[PDB]
Amino acid sequence: NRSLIVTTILEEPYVLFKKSDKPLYGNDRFEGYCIDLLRELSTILGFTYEIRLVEDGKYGAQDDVNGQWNGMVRELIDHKADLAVAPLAITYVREKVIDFSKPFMTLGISILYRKGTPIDSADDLAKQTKIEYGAVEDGATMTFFKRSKISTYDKMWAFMSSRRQSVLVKSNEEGIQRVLTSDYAFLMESTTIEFVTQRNCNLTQIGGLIDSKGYGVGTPMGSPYRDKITLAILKLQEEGKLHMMKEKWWCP
Amino acid sequence: GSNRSLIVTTILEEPYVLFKKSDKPLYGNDRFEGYCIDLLRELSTILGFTYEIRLVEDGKYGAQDDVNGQWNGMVRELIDHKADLAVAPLAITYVREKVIDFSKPFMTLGISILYRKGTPIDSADDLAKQTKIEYGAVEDGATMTFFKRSKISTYDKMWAFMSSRRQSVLVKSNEEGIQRVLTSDYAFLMESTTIEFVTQRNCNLTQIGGLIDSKGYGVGTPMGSPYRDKITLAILKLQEEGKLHMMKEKWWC
Ligand SMILES: N[C@@H](CCC(=O)O)C(=O)O
Ligand SMILES: N[C@@H](CCC(=O)O)C(=O)O
Ligand SMILES: [Cl-]
Ligand SMILES: [Cl-]
Ligand code: NA
Ligand code: NA
Ligand code: NA
Missing domain, CATH: 3.40.190.10 (Periplasmic binding protein-like II)
Known part of the structure; x- marks a missing residue:
């Protein structure tokens, strides 16, 4: 089947470029809590994917004057990504324009x-x-x-x-x-x-x-992945796997 | 010509839902108070619905029988369309989300x-x-x-x-x-x-x-309900306004 395009953003310890002397390619370039999460989702739900960093380097807000969104939110609105897997806050204004899974982390x-x-x-x-x-x-x-x-x-x-x-x-x-x-x-x-x-x-x-608020996986409005990803997150939670992933990635 | 009132299932649990203390006999929705009652009132004004509160008949939150596969409690009331909403300290869980819909959480615990x-x-x-x-x-x-x-x-x-x-x-x-x-x-x-x-x-x-x-508490709805996503939006707006925090402080050595 077609690989899902996954938009994300560099943010330690959620998403980072791996350190290596060896040059890396494709998805192998990335590591972090959100990359571990994505891997688990792909296995649970049976999809393949291609990670792409959001081109404008933004999470996403609406312009005051012209009403346009930017960042990962805009990529999903425009159907340029299938998922945003990142520390992306679920908020009222975003939920009006994109869909989110239930939270994988609360903050x-x-x-x-x-x-x-x-x-x-x-x-x-x-x-x-x-x-x-x-x-x-x-x-x-x-x-x-x-x-x-x-x-x-x-x-x-x-x-x-x-x-x-x-x-x-x-x-x-x-x-x-x-x-x-x-x-x-x-x-x-x-x-x-x-x-x-x-x-x-x-x-x-x-x-x-x-x-x-919580961080959720973003999808375009109406995507069938949103509810499937919520179920997978709830199952991971129940199993203690999200807590283990947090401990993995997270003074005198 | 008004829209049908929504049937809202709930359960007695302090300080979420209680009977008001009164020497005067109370009737209908006026009998109840608590964090979830305040939440319900806010949702009804935001979304524009009327409602009738009913305590879950069997007194249970809800679990599945491992022999016959049937649910009970508020979860079963929603599956069977005996209630439109469950507004209660109802945990959002994997096994429940397979059979009913939930709003996003109004409280985490x-x-x-x-x-x-x-x-x-x-x-x-x-x-x-x-x-x-x-x-x-x-x-x-x-x-x-x-x-x-x-x-x-x-x-x-x-x-x-x-x-x-x-x-x-x-x-x-x-x-x-x-x-x-x-x-x-x-x-x-x-x-x-x-x-x-x-x-x-x-x-x-x-x-x-x-x-x-x-886990989170969410408002429960039957699977497929259009109220689920509307209630998620109303909850996110209340949180952005600080009103859920104010409701928690009100109701909570
Ligand atoms: N995680 C935030 C970005 C960081 C912040 O706003 O503090 C977002 O989803 O927009
Ligand atoms: N709030 C719980 C009931 C109390 C408990 O299980 O500790 C539920 O939704 O089932
Ligand atoms: Cl009616
Ligand atoms: Cl949801
Ligand atoms: Na960045
Ligand atoms: Na949405
Ligand atoms: Na569901």
Whole structure:
């Protein structure tokens, strides 16, 4: 049968290029939690696949003026991919235009910052400007802030939007670097914070979770794969396999 | 000329669904309160439906009979189109999703252990390796089914014990499980969000260990229902607004 086209994005420890002196080709180039997940799905559901990194390097948001989506979300809308297997947040605005499986991981927005400071919450950031803060451009965190009517978060969006050329970044890795090299706090998904703080012992999560959401496999709206992938994820969960995969891929 | 009211099946479970305390007799939907009742009210305004709440006739969440293959509980009510929706702390599971549809989750949780304070018991593994302290779960719910189906060594040993002693250790409700913890040397396998509620109100009890699994509660619908995806959208919008968190804080030593 026809191999499914799978869009994804580089994001440690979900999807990475394998380290090797030997040049690698095709799907063999990739590893990570989401690649392990994809492999399990392919075996359970009986399909073959071809991984392609999303050409624009984006997760996906809707343009304010022209209404067009970008990123992995747009690839699915345009039927240029069959699945998006990535740390792709299931959100209200995305679910209106693409389908998602049920979640394979649950998480929420939180804050990455340096240790040792009196900053303890988003409210602490919102009331000041000396410590800058931001998020990945055209992802779910940015979109949460952009849409929020909660006073702390709407204040924070006004600031991010004002300073966007400096404080919105293209990737989580660029956000981490901004935290390490300037006085900056990064609004980041909590499962990623967990990974980063285990490896950067001067960094910490600030406060708790600001929201709650899950990562799901994306499909074009109406795809028959969406419900099949939900069943496969539920079966993996029941067996403990997703927890094992998390432990596989995830200070003094 | 109005649309038919949806029949919503549910089950008594504090603080999700309860009868209101009142000296005045109450009728119809006005009898009920709780997190799931507030959720249902929000869904009905978002989606534009009216409804009638009915407690599941057989008092069960739902499991499949291994001899005759029939389901029971709220799951069976949906299969048979005796209800339009199930709005309850109904776990989304692989075996249920094969026969009914669920919305995406409105709450995430996992199985853990409820026991009395003051003990060296620290995990399911510690319980499994002994028999002096009995343990069990709600009959014909998701926790029981997780154990019955598990191939993990600790949990399959637990199921063998629970099954052997089921007339004594499987119970009809979380409340009966709590009373067993309080009146005998018994540990109850219970969902974590319910443990959180119970231990905040009885300071003699505690959670033992962490979460054994991960799952969500979802609104159940019959397979193929058009309400499933609409309710998923309404849930995602409520979460994006922070309203589910506010509802949890309202209802929850
Ligand atoms: N995982 C996010 C990107 C990272 C973020 O927004 O914090 C998404 O699905 O858009
Ligand atoms: N909420 C569970 C019942 C309680 C339990 O099994 O622990 C269900 O959906 O079956
Ligand atoms: Cl009617
Ligand atoms: Cl779904
Ligand atoms: Na990237
Ligand atoms: Na959708
Ligand atoms: Na289903």
